[PDB]
Amino acid sequence: LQLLNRQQELNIAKSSAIGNVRIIDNAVTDPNPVRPKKTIIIVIGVVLG
Amino acid sequence: LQLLNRQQELNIAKSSAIGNVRIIDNAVTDPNPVRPKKTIIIVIGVVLG
Numbered sequence A, B: 001l002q003l004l005n006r007q008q009e010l011n012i013a014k015s016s017a018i019g020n021v022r023i024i025d026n027a028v029t030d031p032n033p034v035r036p037k038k039t040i041i042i043v044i045g046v047v048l049g
Helices: A002-016 A038-048 B002-015 B038-048
Strands: none
Touching: none
């Protein structure tokens, strides 16, 4: 019986072990590309010339 | 997805430790604009000239 009592206790603890990490904002994509950074490339090209 | 969103929303309320909330001052707008700052622009223009 004592094993059975522990059997219930382990099951409820396993079922109740939920948390410690939480998702707030789902992944979304910024439509404006981050590379290539056009203007800085053009400025570097001109200055190098 | 909406139900998944609503499910996720209510979970965050569960772990919110903050006591509740209190609003001291509701939002009000300063009638004097913060931009553009006229005098500094004028001074920079003159000095640049």
